[PDB]
Write a protein that binds this ligand. Sequence first.
Ligand code: NA
Length: 121
Amino acid sequence: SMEQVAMELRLTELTRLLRSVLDQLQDKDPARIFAQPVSLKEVPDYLDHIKHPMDFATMRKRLEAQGYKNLHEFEEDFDLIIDNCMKYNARDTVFYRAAVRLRDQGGVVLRQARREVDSIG
Ligand code: NA
């Protein structure tokens, strides 16, 4: 149907918006701390601590499969990246501090993304 193609243009346009949002969030991570999953070989206990690991490559695979149906789902994954890091790493560590800084800078991008997603539809 034509309706299913419109929905799909909508999902497609949301995806385009989420891709820009993603590339802008990932620019706020020059260290590339959040680019790939935490390695279970280098942190064998990780999954005892963190139940839903997240990282930007994993978010990107999902996005390219158009697996984000709204901004809320995308934000949920971005907050996992931050929140997992702040739980696993202590408050004085470079990792923890990078997540706080990513969060603060990410908020600015996301506050406008929410406006575009309502505004465009
Ligand atoms: Na902690």
